[PDB]
């Protein structure tokens, strides 16, 4: 399960693996992927001004640290049909660190 880690390590992971497609700040733009401000406690597929797959929408995930960790392990396994082109983060430590960063960066 998710355990608080290092947002410092997390930020580097996010920057090298996610930032290309996602911004995190309030009012930051949608790009290849949606802006993630407020993602934790929001349902999947709900950010306005972004065109999602029906798959992402229908999943009805209420994003939290634990289901995010499962998603990021292997996105297409968690949401078959998703257009997020990301293989996954296999190490629990990396997901813990990334998610620690993301919670703080998107709140």
Listed ranges 14-22, 31-39, 46-54, 65-73: which one lies at the site for a copy of itself (CB under 8 A): 65-73
Would you give the binding string for a copy of itself spanning residues 67-106, x where CB under 8 A is met? x--x------------------------------------
59 binds, among ligand HEC, a copy of itself, none (CB under 5 to 8 A by kind): a copy of itself
Report the C-alpha gap between 48 and 90 in whole angstroms. 30
Cβ neighbour number for residue 87 with a 10 Å cutoff: 10
Crossing angle of helices 65-73/92-106, nearest 10°?
Answer: 130
């Amino acid at each position: 399960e998710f355990k608080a880690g290092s947002a410092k390590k997390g930020a580097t992971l996010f920057k090298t693996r996610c930032l290309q497609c996602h911004t995190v700040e309030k009012g930051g733009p949608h790009k290849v992927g949606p802006n993630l401000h407020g993602i934790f406690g929001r349902h999947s597929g709900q950010a306005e001004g972004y065109s999602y797959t029906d798959a992402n929408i229908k999943k009805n995930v209420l994003w939290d640290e634990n289901n995010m960790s499962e998603y990021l392990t292997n996105p297409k396994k968690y949401i078959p049909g998703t257009k997020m082109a990301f293989g996954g983060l296999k190490k629990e430590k990396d997901r813990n660190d990334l998610i620690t960063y993301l919670k703080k960066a998107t709140e």
